[PDB]
């Protein structure tokens, strides 16, 4: 209608290949297979037993086209710290969401401290259901907005500090309007 996608993990061809740090043991690609046997590309991490997690994942460079304000819609699922057996003084039920404004569409290592926190993201009231045949993923849907943006594009980062989290859909868009 008047929404215009700059990124939709769901419609991407082949692996996302986003940058994770650490590269292994932190955030990792996981395909959920839908009814026609086509992967939904997720990122997940569940090191709830180990202390001081600090796992980063960043998208590829995303252009803002003309837009000063963009909307980020995350479809996630958390596992409660209650539900996982075992002791866990550092378990979490949120992740952090950051953005970084850049004119360069090929930065290799962006420092954590150039990143600008948009919000801490928890399972709140809002959800979506996605019918994938054998199951219906009930997921949280959060939406945040950011701006005003001025540089050509930007990067999104997701920080985990000890949650059991599956990021199922990341959509970015602006309103043509």
């Amino acid at each position: 209608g008047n929404e215009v996608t700059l990124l939709d993990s769901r419609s991407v061809q082949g692996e996302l290949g986003w940058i994770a740090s650490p590269l292994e043991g932190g955030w990792e690609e996981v395909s959920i297979m839908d009814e026609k046997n086509t992967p939904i590309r997720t990122y997940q991490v569940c090191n709830v037993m180990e202390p001081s997690q600090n796992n980063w994942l960043r998208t590829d460079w995303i252009t803002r086209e003309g837009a000063q304000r963009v909307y980020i819609e995350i479809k996630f699922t958390l596992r409660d710290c209650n539900s996982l057996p075992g002791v866990m003084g550092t378990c979490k039920e949120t992740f952090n969401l950051y953005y970084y404004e850049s004119d360069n569409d090929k930065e290799r290592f962006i420092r954590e401290n150039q990143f600008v926190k948009i919000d801490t993201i928890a399972a709140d009231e809002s959800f979506t259901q996605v019918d994938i045949g054998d199951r219906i993923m009930k997921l949280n849907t959060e939406i945040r907005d950011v701006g005003p943006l001025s540089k050509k594009g930007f990067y999104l980062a997701f920080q985990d500090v000890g949650a059991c989290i599956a990021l199922v859909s990341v959509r970015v868009f602006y309103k043509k309007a």
Partner: peptide
């Protein structure tokens, strides 16, 4: 190893 993995449903 992740403690659990979501493949449409959690799975620990």
């Amino acid at each position: 190893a992740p403690y659990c993995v979501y493949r449409g449903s959690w799975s620990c």
